[PDB]
Amino acid sequence: SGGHPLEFLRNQPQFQQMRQIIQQNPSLLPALLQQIGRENPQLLQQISQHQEHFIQMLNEPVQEAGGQGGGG
Numbered sequence: 001s002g003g004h005p006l007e008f009l010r011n012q013p014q015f016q017q018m019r020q021i022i023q024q025n026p027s028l029l030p031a032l033l034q035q036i037g038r039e040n041p042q043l044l045q046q047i048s049q050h051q052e053h054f055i056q057m058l059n060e061p062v063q064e065a066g067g068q069g070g071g072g
Helices: 007-011 013-022 027-039 041-049 053-058
Strands: none
Touching: 007 041, 013 053, 027 041, 041 053
């Protein structure tokens, strides 16, 4: 109803870093997802296999998490 289906992505500081960039240009969205695809495909696949609600955390800026040891 408005939560993060991808808890694993909250463990991704890279996703938070890139998050700001996608909000600037959603055109580079697949390009950023591309890099992680070779880093950990099983992880990027989870994003697509979970509830579409994930887009919320995708379009919302990083002010929460930023990897273990960092916050938004």
